[PDB]
Design a protein around this ligand. Structure first.
Ligand SMILES: *C(=O)[C@H](C[C@@H]1CCCNC1=O)NC(=O)[C@H](CC(C)C)NC(=O)[C@@H](NC(=O)c1ccc([N+](=O)[O-])cc1)C(C)C
Ligand SMILES: *C(=O)[C@H](C[C@@H]1CCCNC1=O)NC(=O)[C@H](CC(C)C)NC(=O)[C@@H](NC(=O)c1ccc([N+](=O)[O-])cc1)C(C)C
Lengths: 306, 306
């Protein structure tokens, strides 16, 4: 028993990280087959990051302006192209450690692991959610750009996030691996504020189920609620509306615990209106919203990958 | 910016995990060079876990009673010995993926990453703290024994924990890699008194320093405190008493931020006595105690957000 914020094992992605340097700018790239993917702003200069003309700047870049270092091996760039906000550097050698992989674009409310890297060297792994306002609350310093987010399904790595920038509120924004930003952001050092963030209601409910599974049951009551009456209360506390699709996705956790979804909603309604009365749930005084229902089932059943 | 509970990248440890089966009991083993390390209770059957004579069970076993599997490859056991609570199975093949490594025994309050494994395959990775009473608050199901905890310094893995059991309170206990239990515990299914679990004060202080480094000072104040006046408040709130040894460990964070250790203690004392009043620190409403001073320096910017 026990419930932890758990990241995917990172070994398959560790073997894909490289250092990419252009001019005096260094960041990380992702080496899959004979292509290295990295944020296109590696080609900018300090003097240019206000509103870079990326297409123009790339014209004046040759293959040998890109230094790609994979551990002890320098990779030769034999071709370069730009796809939206990512650069694709074709290289001499196919990565022998390339896993089975897909590029996916995730929905807000979904979770993924981030492999934080610096100078092509992985330094940490942690679990994140795509916020409703398309930001992530990551932990990224200078040099972290090109770090990637991913999920693992059996033996296949689904890459969903590449890191590009930090917002003034200290949260983070990036692209999918096709270079398309999540949310209304652009890769320029301009004035950019994210929409108001909301709590991911279906994830909070999933985590209350995790708590019950792990013996923490004090918040269960004998009240009932309809979906509409729950959503009338939840919206006033800045929670996302709960849809019928969300209720369906909570079906398996409901069957396992014997607690109806709308009964769990009633317990959450009491927590919102009355507070915790000084208590915690799974050690938290705030309600956790970065576990999906799939995250809870997977962890509580010991699903394995590699 | 940002601050996340970050685990070490798990790839170096994933390459070491194997499955060990004896009779009908399967758990995880750690394959380093030509030795597989695993918990000695792999040789137990369900009916004799109340008072197993481990040197009763082991003399009855031959090398070929141990089935060791790495991937789809059987490893042939050519020798075995018991050291404290761990079994050492000599195998006929050195692990080609053995990293540089050490075995270290850590102190209460210190942290490590756990690669939770089932049947020799990894399920996930997360960061843990050794509690003051030598337990850990993990996520371990049936079959997780032999999962290990570790730190990585450059490319040397320091293994410090191997998982053995869950206590009746839902917390977890295990050994160092020489098989010595952390805490006054033994590998049998009998009631064993545990010390009381207090909050790791030096780690809370380190995390307040992290909040300052990242740009937040709202919780500071002008008082100072003596060590003893602080510890009187600490014990009211179930915090571990702070020693001069602990104060010395916070030296680097104190110097980096310009806040004397006993001034941060005065700040913590006021947070405990007055609560948070709806505010948060690094996103938390409860003070975090699973970051050591070293963890903070490893994750935070070397440049304080002044
Ligand atoms: C890549 O490595 C680097 C990572 C950043 C660096 C700062 C610390 N944490 C990180 O995650 N990314 C960049 O340097 C990126 C380059 C651009 C996209 C070309 N720049 C930023 O992240 C900057 N953020 C902004 O410039 C920004 C400023 C103001 C506003 N605003 O609403 O006013 C929005 C965005 C960093 C401040 C350098
Ligand atoms: C190994 O895989 C397995 C892991 C356990 C399994 C249950 C779920 N979570 C885990 O971490 N370890 C065991 O099965 C272990 C083998 C013994 C130690 C020979 N048994 C247990 O973990 C049981 N624990 C106890 O019975 C127990 C009772 C009291 C104390 N104590 O110190 O007071 C310690 C252990 C579980 C009930 C299965």
């Amino acid at each position: 028993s026990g419930f932890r914020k758990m990241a995917f094992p990172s070994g398959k992605v560790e073997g894909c990280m490289v250092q990419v340097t252009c001019g005096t700018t260094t960041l990380n790239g992702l080496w899959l087959d004979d292509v290295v993917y990295c944020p296109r702003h590696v080609i900018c200069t300090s003097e240019d990051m206000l509103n870079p003309n990326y297409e123009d700047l790339l014209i004046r870049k040759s293959n040998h302006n890109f230094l790609v270092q994979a551990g002890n091996v320098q990779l030769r760039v034999i071709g370069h192209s730009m796809q939206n906000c990512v650069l694709k550097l074709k290289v001499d050698t196919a990565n022998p450690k390339t896993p089975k992989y897909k590029f996916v674009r995730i929905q807000p409310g979904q979770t993924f692991s981030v492999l934080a890297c610096y100078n092509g060297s992985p330094s940490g792994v942690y679990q994140c959610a795509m916020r409703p306002n398309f930001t992530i609350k990551g932990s990224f310093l200078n040099g972290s750009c090109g770090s990637v987010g991913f999920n693992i399904d059996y033996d296949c790595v689904s890459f969903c996030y590449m890191h590009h920038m930090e917002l003034p509120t200290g949260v983070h924004a990036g692209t999918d691996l096709e270079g398309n930003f999540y949310g209304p952001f652009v890769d320029r050092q301009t004035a950019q504020a994210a929409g108001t963030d909301t709590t991911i209601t279906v994830n909070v409910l999933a985590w209350l189920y995790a708590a019950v599974i792990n013996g923490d049951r004090w918040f269960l009551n004998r009240f009932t609620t309809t979906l509409n009456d729950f959503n009338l209360v939840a919206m006033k506390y800045n929670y996302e509306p709960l849809t019928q699709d969300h209720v369906d996705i909570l079906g398996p956790l409901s069957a396992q615990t014997g607690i109806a979804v709308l009964d769990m909603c009633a317990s959450l309604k009491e927590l919102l209106q009355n507070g915790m009365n000084g208590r915690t749930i799974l050690g938290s005084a705030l309600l956790e919203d970065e576990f999906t229902p799939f995250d809870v089932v997977r962890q509580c059943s010991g699903v394995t990958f590699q």
